[PDB]
Amino acid sequence: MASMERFLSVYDEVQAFLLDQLQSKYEIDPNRARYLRIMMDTTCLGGKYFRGMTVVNVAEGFLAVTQHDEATKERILHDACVGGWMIEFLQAHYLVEDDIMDGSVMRRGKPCWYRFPGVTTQCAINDGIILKSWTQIMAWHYFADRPFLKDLLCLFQKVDYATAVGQMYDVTSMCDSNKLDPEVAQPMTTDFAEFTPAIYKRIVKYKTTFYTYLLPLVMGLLVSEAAASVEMNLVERVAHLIGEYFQVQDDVMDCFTPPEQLGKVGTDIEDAKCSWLAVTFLGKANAAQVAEFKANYGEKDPAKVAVVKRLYSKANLQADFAAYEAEVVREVESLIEQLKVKSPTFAESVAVVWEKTHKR
Amino acid sequence: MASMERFLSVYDEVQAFLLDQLQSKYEIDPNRARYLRIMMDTTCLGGKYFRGMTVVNVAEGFLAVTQHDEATKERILHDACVGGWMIEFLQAHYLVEDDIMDGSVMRRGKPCWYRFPGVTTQCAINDGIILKSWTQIMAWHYFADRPFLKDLLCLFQKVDYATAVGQMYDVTSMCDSNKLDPEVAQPMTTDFAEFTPAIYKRIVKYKTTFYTYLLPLVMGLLVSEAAASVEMNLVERVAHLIGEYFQVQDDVMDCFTPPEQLGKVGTDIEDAKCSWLAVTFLGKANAAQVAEFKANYGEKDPAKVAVVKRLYSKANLQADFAAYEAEVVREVESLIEQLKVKSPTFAESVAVVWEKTHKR
Numbered sequence: 001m002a003s004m005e006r007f008l009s010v011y012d013e014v015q016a017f018l019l020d021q022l023q024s025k026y027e028i029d030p031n032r033a034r035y036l037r038i039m040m041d042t043t044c045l046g047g048k049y050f051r052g053m054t055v056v057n058v059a060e061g062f063l064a065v066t067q068h069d070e071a072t073k074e075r076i077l078h079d080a081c082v083g084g085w086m087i088e089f090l091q092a093h094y095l096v097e098d099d100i101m102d103g104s105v106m107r108r109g110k111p112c113w114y115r116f117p118g119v120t121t122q123c124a125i126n127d128g129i130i131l132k133s134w135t136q137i138m139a140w141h142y143f144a145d146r147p148f149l150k151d152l153l154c155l156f157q158k159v160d161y162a163t164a165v166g167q168m169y170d171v172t173s174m175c176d177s178n179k180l181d182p183e184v185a186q187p188m189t190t191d192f193a194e195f196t197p198a199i200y201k202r203i204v205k206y207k208t209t210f211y212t213y214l215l216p217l218v219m220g221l222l223v224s225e226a227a228a229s230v231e232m233n234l235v236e237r238v239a240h241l242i243g244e245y246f247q248v249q250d251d252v253m254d255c256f257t258p259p260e261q262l263g264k265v266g267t268d269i270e271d272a273k274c275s276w277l278a279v280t281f282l283g284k285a286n287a288a289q290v291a292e293f294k295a296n297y298g299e300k301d302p303a304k305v306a307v308v309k310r311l312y313s314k315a316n317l318q319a320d321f322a323a324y325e326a327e328v329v330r331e332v333e334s335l336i337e338q339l340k341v342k343s344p345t346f347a348e349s350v351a352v353v354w355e356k357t358h359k360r
Numbered sequence: 361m362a363s364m365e366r367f368l369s370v371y372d373e374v375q376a377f378l379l380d381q382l383q384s385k386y387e388i389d390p391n392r393a394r395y396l397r398i399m400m401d402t403t404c405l406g407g408k409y410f411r412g413m414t415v416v417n418v419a420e421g422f423l424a425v426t427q428h429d430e431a432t433k434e435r436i437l438h439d440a441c442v443g444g445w446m447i448e449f450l451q452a453h454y455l456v457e458d459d460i461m462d463g464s465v466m467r468r469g470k471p472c473w474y475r476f477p478g479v480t481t482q483c484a485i486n487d488g489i490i491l492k493s494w495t496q497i498m499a500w501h502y503f504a505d506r507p508f509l510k511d512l513l514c515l516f517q518k519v520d521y522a523t524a525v526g527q528m529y530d531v532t533s534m535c536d537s538n539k540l541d542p543e544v545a546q547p548m549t550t551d552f553a554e555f556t557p558a559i560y561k562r563i564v565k566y567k568t569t570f571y572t573y574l575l576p577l578v579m580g581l582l583v584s585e586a587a588a589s590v591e592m593n594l595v596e597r598v599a600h601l602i603g604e605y606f607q608v609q610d611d612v613m614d615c616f617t618p619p620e621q622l623g624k625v626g627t628d629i630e631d632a633k634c635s636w637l638a639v640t641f642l643g644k645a646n647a648a649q650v651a652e653f654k655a656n657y658g659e660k661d662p663a664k665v666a667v668v669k670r671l672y673s674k675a676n677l678q679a680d681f682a683a684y685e686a687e688v689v690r691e692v693e694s695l696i697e698q699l700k701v702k703s704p705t706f707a708e709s710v711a712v713v714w715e716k717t718h719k720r
């Protein structure tokens with residue numbers, strides 16, 4: 001059976017299980033079950049399923065080199081799909097909540113969930129809560145007797161916590177750290193002293209890389225009972241390297257990909273985000289360019305946004321991206337080589353993950 | 361050592377552990393650690409600690425009748441305090457998110473967390489996420505080697521899910537179920553056919569009783585390794601009975617307790633909530649009283665709110681509350697008697713929980 005089709009069939013199974021349990025154990029009525037079914041479909045489906053499919057791909061890699069009964073191969077693939085959906089539902093939770101936190105308008109070419117007429121923020125915050133609760137219901141039901149259940153739940157909660165910490169790093173990245181104070185309304189920075197490569201790397205590591213690359217790779221190893229087969233420090237290093245590149249691509253797309261292709265009107269400039277473009281620009285700008293950036297960044301005014309986009313184009317940030325990309329290709333290839341010492345199979349899944357990221 | 365003082369000392373220990381881990385493993389800077397320390401204090405402290413202290417009280421009950429080394433008694437009490445704080449932090453998560461969902465103004469005589477000038481909804485949604493993530497960090501750290509870890513995490517995630525389902529039942533209680541639809545803005549009911557005792561009991565059971573009574577009682581049994589000592593079906597029945605009474609008290613207080621004592625301006629009438637007062641009023645009103653209720657309920661207009669409060673006073677709902685209370689006293693005493701068959705100690709903790717609820 002083809003990987004994507006198995007993955008999508010498992011979504012139907014998981015959905016039916018969750019909705020049937022709400023009826024038999026939670027006293028749900030048919031109308032609220034329908035609302036939750038539509039919420040699950042709208043928030044969980046329509047993406048590329050890159051995170052979920054990475055778990056499946058890692059597990060398939062090991063099945064090709066490990067001896068198992070057919071029933072065991074089916075069980076491992078079904079566990080990889082359920083684990084992959086845990087990650088997709090975790091992402092769905094953070095997209096719902098982040099779109100509300102940021103006042104976003106569109107997501108995946110459609111309105112953000114909270115903007116649906118019959119949803120509203122009052123419901124959407126709780127719907128996002130339910131999405132993450134469903135990841136735990138899935139784990140306890142499908143993996144009840146599995147030897148990896150403890151390790152999987154412990155890893156999943158560390159990654160979820162790291163992600164929430166990353167969201168805090170992201171939403172506060174335009175403020176001066178010494179001025180953070182719940183009692184005082186937060187002004188935007190004027191000096192941009194905290195727009196540095198090291199601070200940018202911390203935001204990205206926590207807000208994206210743990211759940212987008214580390215969790216799918218390690219979940220694939222856990223469902224395969226193959227973690228003792230790899231060097232965990234190399235898995236962490238390669239995940240944080242590919243994840244950073246993935247976020248740099250997203251930051252560039254936010255500013256330069258047309259809204260039809262991107263599926264939204266990007267507002268990182270208006271939001272004064274500590275993006276790869278702003279940090280890189282400040283890393284090469286002269287005094288006049290820095291001054292013009294400070295006078296225009298973080299403002300809703302489209303003329304001020306146009307000035308910032310022009311500064312980025314005039315600063316030839318394409319050259320910096322090509323240099324960054326060449327360095328990442330180099331380091332990712334080095335880590336893949338080190339991963340071959342203990343597992344050529346796992347190093348190959350990492351090469352596939354990299355190729356899919358680099359070529360998207 | 362006195363129960364409350366041990367419980368509060370453990371808060372300091374848990375706080376220091378969480379903040380120190382953010383520094384050593386999550387690359388946090390001192391300013392963001394301070395923001396999170398103030399967020400934890402503001403959202404977790406200041407209440408009565410009824411839920412957390414129930415875990416401690418149940419564990420103390422068993423220590424009085426069970427043989428243990430002194431070091432074991434200290435370990436069980438410390439585990440009961442950590443488990444009690446898991447529940448208090450879970451409540452802190454739901455209060456932060458519910459205040460944002462409901463547009464609430466005050467909580468515990470102070471502004472709701474999202475209303476603090478340096479917080480905002482953008483941060484507060486994520487702060488509420490972190491509060492629940494901290495419950496899992498606490499469990500995995502303090503209970504890593506405990507025999508009850510699996511049962512405790514499985515119970516905690518079922519209770520959290522039941523609570524989020526309850527929040528959905530609550531926020532949609534003023535809509536007609538057949539009209540629920542993410543695509544269509546939801547009108548308030550005109551017939552109030554879903555304001556019935558059975559529907560009210562479902563909202564309350566899920567939104568309050570699992571986390572306020574069931575979870576503290578069962579967590580006290582788990583940390584004491586005493587679950588096989590009680591009949592779980594009686595624990596569930598007594599928890600859902602006391603929890604319902606607790607919510608009925610809160611619904612009456614929302615409408616009639618002055619804002620200074622309540623710590624907020626109650627708005628259940630304006631919000632068209634399916635409260636004990638509305639269901640009970642509709643259960644005894646004549647046609648004219650029903651018609652006047654329909655013309656005034658669920659409106660911000662203070663004159664319309666005053667009409668509803670007058671209808672409640674004229675309908676002599678105090679008599680219905682006294683009859684409900686007499687019936688609860690009767691059923692709670694019956695369940696306490698049944699609990700004595702297997703454990704006089706546990707039945708006594710249930711009597712204390714009831715006395716604290718009934719006399720508050």
Ligand SMILES: O=C(O)Cc1c(C(=O)O)[nH]c2c(Cl)cc(Cl)cc12
Binds near residue numbers: 253256312316
């Ligand atoms: O390659 C693109 O996505 C398009 C693109 C444009 C542009 O469209 O003018 N400008 C860019 C700059 Cl300044 C930096 C980087 Cl890294 C990419 C681009």
Ligand SMILES: O=C(O)Cc1c(C(=O)O)[nH]c2c(Cl)cc(Cl)cc12
Binds near residue numbers: 613674676677681
């Ligand atoms: O006992 C109170 O909390 C006060 C109170 C008042 C009132 O203050 O007029 N009115 C009530 C009604 Cl209609 C029903 C119930 Cl059960 C209680 C009250």
Ligand SMILES: [Zn+2]
Binds near residue numbers: 101
């Ligand atoms: Zn965001």
Ligand SMILES: [Zn+2]
Binds near residue numbers: 250251254
């Ligand atoms: Zn972006």
Ligand SMILES: [Zn+2]
Binds near residue numbers: 459462
């Ligand atoms: Zn609410």
Ligand SMILES: [Zn+2]
Binds near residue numbers: 610611614
């Ligand atoms: Zn209330």
